[PDB]
Amino acid sequence: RKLISATDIQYSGSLLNSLNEQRGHGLFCDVTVIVEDRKFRAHKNILSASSTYFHQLFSVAGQVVELSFIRAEIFAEILNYIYSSKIVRVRSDLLDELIKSGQLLGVKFIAAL
């Protein structure tokens, strides 16, 4: 007779922090993204969910992907967003580059800054 519903407002945040902690260790990371002279380990499921570019890319098999036209430190910030919902203390002189990286990768919130 009785139907029960409940919503955990803390969940999606805790989950993202845990996913970011994993990423720091490379745990469960199933792709490496090479950007200039840097390699970033990440999770395909998260990248696919959050980037229209990666969503397209990860329909093809492959464990290493290479990005052109984005500087490593800018990609580092895009990934920090993907793994947190936030951009934190970005120099204003980098913002145009960050926006452009969001545009290229199809990360809507970043492209809209």
Distant-in-sequence, close-in-space partners of 28: CB < 8 Å, separation ≥ 6: 22, 43
Way it was determined: X-ray
Geometric angle at alpha carbon 88, from 100 and 95, rounded to 5°: 25
Q: Residues, the chain, total?
A: 113
**Resolution to one decimal, Å:** 1.7
By 3-state DSSP, what share of the chain in percent is helix, strand and coil, each rounded to 5?
50, 10, 35
Q: How far is CA 61 from CA 42, 44, 48, 65, in A?
A: 15, 11, 13, 10
| Residue 100: both structure tokens together | 């452009």
Q: Where in the chain are the domains?
A: 1-113
CATH number of 1-113: 3.30.710.10
Geometric angle at alpha carbon 23, from 56 and 81, rounded to 5°: 65
d(CA 102, CA 95): 10
Taking a C-beta distance cutoff of 8 angstroms, is the pair 76, 88 a contact? no
- The strand order across the sheet containing 31-35 reads 38-42, 31-35, 64-67
Q: Would you give the DSSP letter of residue 106?
A: T
